[PDB]
DNA sequence: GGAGCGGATCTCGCA
DNA sequence: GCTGCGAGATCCGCTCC
DNA sequence: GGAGCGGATCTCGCA
DNA sequence: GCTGCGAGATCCGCTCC
């Protein structure tokens, strides 16, 4: 055990084996072998970079914008994250003024709330940021040299080019082909359960009305007592909290200390008596 | 089911329009149109997804204007000149952005042609060309033109590009403006589209 | 909805009906474990109810 | 049904929708929509290439050979498919004579039976093929411009370079570093259940002896009657067949008509009486 | 037992 | 003070006629 | 309830 | 008349002390 630890350490120094090999050879614990191999400076220096990956924002009023080239043609593409609706336009160049005109036309057609884009001569500048602040749109810029950040628009690039290849012979005008592919990718898709992306966008916009939420101003208000649960060990009651929503078998509590929403089963929830 | 006889009786008693009956009884649009056509008084003398197309001159600027009759939704663009190819491209983009079902316009060179008529039959939209008879479309489009030019005059110096001013005017007249029960001319169109979708899904 | 497992996003589970939706996150019923789960708005999609 | 089929066909001609979209819109069967979409010449022309992939031979005495470059050094690598044992050698160039010397030395060290390689100035030639026929080694050449064919040696290239990066400072001579990485990748690996690849190769070579199989020349011989089973429908008895191996609940029969080995349950197997 | 069918699974290429 | 993605093919396992 | 542990899962880069 | 591959990280769900 302890006696053969220096032997395993020197063997790994001499040959740079693996933790499993050391454990199977010298009988040392797997944890000890892992500690030995992870402490090797040579192994750390030449180790392969970590492989962890995330996901895009996928907001409701979230749009990703990008440029693309197609046979000496420049196309600007906007992609809605939630529904999947796309909007493409032929642009002469990539100047800031053209992008500003296109983006404010895009705002005019429908009202977004956030935008995601990468670094670029026109995406980031002085005038464009002022315009976005004037419109009131949250703008986020991805990590440079990470095209995977705007994955959705990149995939829609494929889905647009592949379909547009079919409609070129049908129409003599390129803008006509763009409108046709917008038809076949927005209205005539009808994918999944049988709802086109335009239908999803229309439904989401319709339900977004705040006047519906403002129709009723009277609702019962209740307060509750709850405690944390760490590793199955009960804690202590932490103040009174306003009930967010009451279902069956569980409840939702907003912790101010962590400023986060948590779910608590009825076995750890109690109710204060109502005012009388 | 009884809504159809109720609407028939109410139209016999009062002779209202199809849109009001559709909104207040929820009857199918086809049934409302059938009731309207079956009235001899109305026949011998305001539809959803019904559009009007017009041209506008603005101190040498050519503007193409699309107006929805039921909802005050205005779509304005800049056109280099009155040409059949440009009109076809613009109308295909317009059908790309919206989901129309009918169109009304005047008798014009680019409006009336074999190519554009074939293209509109290809899209599958009813077209009516001629002198308007209902004394509502002319006044509505005149108001649209007047408001559009007034807003364009107001907002031109703030921005640089003319298309920028046009987009700003569209923003002001389609979203920012409100009326009735605090509703916008763009939310009404979305509500109507959602109602049509749910009715179509329920029926077939 | 979707969850994060082993540092990577999971598959798009659903469809399902939302129970309560507030700012930042919504609470939903899960079928795999019959447990309530709260999920932020950054990993959800909104769909009208089916037929 | 039949009435709306021309409508769906013309709609797909006009817009080039998807089969699911047509099925959800016009109510036509999914099979009909699939037939319509697959018959579209435009869709067929622009469709993405098929994605089917296979696997390497993974034989017992199967070896894959390849060249590689490492900082103005040329290394020839041989990889055994079954055990995973590797053998690398520094080579001055890529001439045919050097490859012939290296490959016959490789044969001298241990006896293989088959080799897999790609097209090359030295892999395929007149003298090398004569040498391989002289030695009696089956040679297979992969598809040109398909480096994925020799996947095993390509992966061992990574596993060799990554480990060799660690041992360069330890030894002044490059050949010493190659021998050290051979040590740490062949003998000191001890991966999996706790057996090094050299152990697997040694065991496989030891059990390959034919004298063990030739020790016994007496064994009971039996014959059997069997019939085919197609879609659960019984067939007819097809001649007498020699039993290959008799277990419990099943038997193995070599069909001469298909020249293939099949497994038949006891419910479809009967035995002829033994000679008396 | 024939039959279609919903869904898990695969690769590859946008930057 | 943040992020990979899905369209287009192919069968299995299923149940229903 | 603490504890380690065997194994499914992930990406990326050989050509 | 044939072919993608695995090493190196990371947690879950497990059971045993
Ligand atoms: Ca890009
Ligand atoms: Ca190679
Ligand atoms: Zn080490
Ligand atoms: Zn009438
Ligand atoms: Zn087609």
UniProtKB/Swiss-Prot annotation, chains A, D:
Top-rank taxon, per record: Viruses
Residue stretches making up the Integrase catalytic domain: 45-205
Residue spans binding DNA: 222-274
Binding-site positions, Mg(2+) 3: 66, 118, 154
Annotated residues for binding of Zn(2+): 12, 16, 40, 43
ZnF start-end (Integrase-type): 3-44
Extent of the signal sequence: none
Function: Catalyzes viral DNA integration into the host chromosome, by performing a series of DNA cutting and joining reactions.
Subunit structure: Homotetramer; further associates as a homohexadecamer.
Name of the protein in its database record: Integrase
Organism per entry: Maedi visna virus (strain KV1772) (MVV)
Underlying gene: pol
Full-sequence portion shown in this chain: 1226 to 1501 of 1506
Swiss-Prot record, chain C:
Domain of life: Viruses
DNA-binding region extent: 1-49
Record's function text: Catalyzes viral DNA integration into the host chromosome, by performing a series of DNA cutting and joining reactions.
Assembly notes: Homotetramer; further associates as a homohexadecamer.
Protein name, UniProt field: Integrase
């Amino acid at each position: 055990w302890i006696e053969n630890i220096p032997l395993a350490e020197e063997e790994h120094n001499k040959w740079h084996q693996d933790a499993v090999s050391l454990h199977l050879e010298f009988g040392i614990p797997r944890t000890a072998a892992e500690d030995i191999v992870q402490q090797c400076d040579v192994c750390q220096e030449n180790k392969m970079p970590s492989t962890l990956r995330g996901s895009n924002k996928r907001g409701i009023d979230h749009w990703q914008v990008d440029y693309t080239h197609y046979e000496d043609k420049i196309i600007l593409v906007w992609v809605e994250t939630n529904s999947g609706l796309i909007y493409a336009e032929r642009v002469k160049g990539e100047t800031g003024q053209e992008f500003r005109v296109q983006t404010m036309k895009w705002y005019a057609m429908f009202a977004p709330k956030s935008l995601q884009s990468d670094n670029g001569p026109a995406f980031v500048a002085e005038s464009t940021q002022l315009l976005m602040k004037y419109l009131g749109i949250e703008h986020t810029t991805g990590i440079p040299w990470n095209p995977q950040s705007q994955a959705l628009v990149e995939r829609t690039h494929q889905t647009l080019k592949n379909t547009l290849e079919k409609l070129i012979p049908m129409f003599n005008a390129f803008e006509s082909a763009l409108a046709g592919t917008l038809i076949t990718l927005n209205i005539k898709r009808k994918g999944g359960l049988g709802t086109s992306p335009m239908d999803i966008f229309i439904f989401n916009k319709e339900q977004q009305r705040i006047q519906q939420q403002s129709k009723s101003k009277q609702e019962k208000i209740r307060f509750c007592y709850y405690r944390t649960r760490k590793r199955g060990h009960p804690g202590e009651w932490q103040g009174p909290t306003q009930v967010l929503w009451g279902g069956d078998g569980a409840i939702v509590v907003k912790d101010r200390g962590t400023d986060r929403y948590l779910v608590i089963a009825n076995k750890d929830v109690k109710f204060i008596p109502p005012p009388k």
